[model samples]
Target chain A: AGFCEVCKKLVGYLDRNLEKNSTKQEILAALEKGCSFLPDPYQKQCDQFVAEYEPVLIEILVEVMDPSFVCLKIGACP
Target chain B: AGFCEVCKKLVGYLDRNLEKNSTKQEILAALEKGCSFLPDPYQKQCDQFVAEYEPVLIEILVEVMDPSFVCLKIGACPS
Candidate 1:
């Protein structure tokens, strides 16, 4: 699968960063709050990381990562 | 919902440029042709745009954007 495996691992990295206790509003606020601190280079790295794994990420999320379920019970919405 | 809207607009741009009559092979060829024009910086911007709107893009595609539908109608045999 080449870099596909790496992309899957990176998805885990992204998902793990979501706070289990966070609400949608809190999550949105947190993202906005953190935005200013992100350097342009690191931002690009983040973007490259996402793009590289996009196919896998989309498949997994649609097939397995049910955000509706996650939001209702787990308090983390994708 | 901020940059997310912008990302959706960009997808529209991408979709619009794709020939309605294009087969998958043609679409792939077009992508390869266009890719060379992207400088490293603009390419980075593209990546950023994708990442920003990934959630929305995934949601919509899974719920709608059926590639099979396009291929079947466009006469492209799915390999």
Candidate 2:
């Protein structure tokens, strides 16, 4: 329905996606897609929010996906 | 005029207060007051944000307000 529960709906969707088969890249893509649907001021805010979360979430995803994989070491070497 | 952009205006106000001589309690009080003026859905969100920040910010404020005061030891034993 068009009557969405805003934060609850979005948070639920995020949690579900995070729990399921969602990659860091895919989650970011989804954020972009959903945010594109919003309007002006909110759209800008959403863009900023997404940008802020991207790096942090990607790092988190890496940690969750591979605990032993040293991100700093990989970055330093490559 | 009641002309205000939702997030920006509120966040700007918060930033200004945070930068100035504002206590944690004062910020929370302002949050409660401002939140009381908001309508349903938004009021609930604002309340949640304030509630979530309360403990975290109180801890931060305690640390900032009294760096030398041993909070844990004080809690463990009376003065």
Instruction: Note the Cα lDDT for every prediction shown.
Output: 0.39, 0.41
lDDT of 2 by residue, A1-78 (tens): 111233223333355455545766876666556544543323433443444445654555434433122222223111
**What DockQ does model 1 achieve?**
0.08
Badly placed stretches (over 4 Å) of model 2 are: A1-12, A18-21, A32-51, A62-78, B1-31, B38-79
Instruction: Please provide, for model 1 over B1-79, each residue's C-alpha lDDT reduced to its tens digit, 9 standing for 90 to 100.
Output: 1233223334444455665555555544544344223443334344444544345443443333344443233232232
Docking class of 2: incorrect
Clashes of 2: 0
lDDT of 1 at A25: 56
